[model samples]
Target chain A: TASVVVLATAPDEATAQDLAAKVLAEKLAAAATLIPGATSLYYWEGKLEQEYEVQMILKTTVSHQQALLEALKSHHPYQTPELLVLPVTHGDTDYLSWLNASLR
Target chain B: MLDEKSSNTASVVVLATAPDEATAQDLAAKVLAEKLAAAATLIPGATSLYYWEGKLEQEYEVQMILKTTVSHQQALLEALKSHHPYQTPELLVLPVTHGDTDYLSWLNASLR
Candidate 1:
């Protein structure tokens, strides 16, 4: 069994928490960590734009990545959102078990 | 080579935590200036719960998400840990499977 951390962003902490709560309740992911005051700097339509954003990290199994991604995308306000999956090469054993149990 | 189908050249994000917002931002700025990471995102007011010395400890901390490639992962980790105040900091590597073209390009360009 493999674990992963899904990376995504939100406009603010409130929306980030809401989105995290919704999917967590549904067992789409085990845990969600929201960090506020994150800035997103990227070229949008050939122009560099930087904005305040909240970074959200959701922990779950590899099997849940696709479903989790869709659920997050559906709830996110942005039509195109920054959602990516990063494989967890390893983690603390107890923490990993706690995450696995959360979804079960 | 930025090949979407290949995982060999994939970028990665390192997860670490700091004692407070100030330390978090300081480490972030230093790493970015060194080009060890493309960007470091800082999130303050985080509650970290864990077992320490047979007791569950809950402490307020700051979360850091750093962007870099696989090749830079080791050096980035070393740099971040050396400056970290914690005796044993949370340094974990998560491999990026995929990312946006433009942003990834910028990420690659930002690092040494």
Candidate 2:
């Protein structure tokens, strides 16, 4: 299966870590990298909102994308969470191999 | 051509590697000065281990994250390719689905 990267935003560090750990435990993702201190500004409920957010970058394969996305959505606090899947056209050979091996 | 529906629906995240911190900083500065990106984040002291030629290789490199829009993706990439020090620099473009309208506007403005 082809590999992909999934980007999701968490409300806080705690939530980010929780999702990462859960996904890793479930083998939904090979690796989950968190980048905290991200400022997210978007429109919500007819108003503009800005808040500190944590970005989660998950490494997995296309086979697991749907399951992983569903898991994240169910666990996320936001009613409408962000889940963007980026296609990995190319990457380091070893890194890509490791990513695939780590997932089911 | 991008229609109104897709015009602002995508953003580009450019990833590249530099030999060292100085080069990384210089690249980021050039990206900003040239209005190729709205912002650039640098991560230094990244150890990259890979197989090259006939043997395994390892190198210390700095990672650069350049945030721009889909419209200017080609220009930014071409500029980066020209300015990069490496013969075959690693440059990857990631498409972003959702972003703050204001921030996206800022990114578009920076490119223009």
Q: Please state the CAPRI-style docking class of candidate 2.
A: incorrect
Model 1 Cα shift for residue A46 (angstroms): 19
Please give, for residues B20-110, the per-residue lDDT of candidate 1 as tens digits. 8778777877777778887666766779999989999999998777888988999999999999999889999877876444456667887
Instruction: State which candidate has the highest DockQ.
Output: 1
- Which stretches of model 2 miss by more than 4 angstroms? A1-32, A35-104, B1-8
lDDT of 2 by residue, A2-102 (tens): 78888778989999999999999999999999887655433333333445667788989877876787788778898656565677778999998998888
- Give interface RMSD (Å), model 2: 8.9
Cα lDDT tens digits, model 2, B1-68, are 22224444567788888898777767767766767766665556678887778899899997666777
> Cα lDDT of all candidates, in order?
0.79, 0.73
Worst window of 10 by summed lDDT in candidate 2 chain A: A41-50
Q: Which candidate gets the maximum lDDT versus the true structure? A: 1
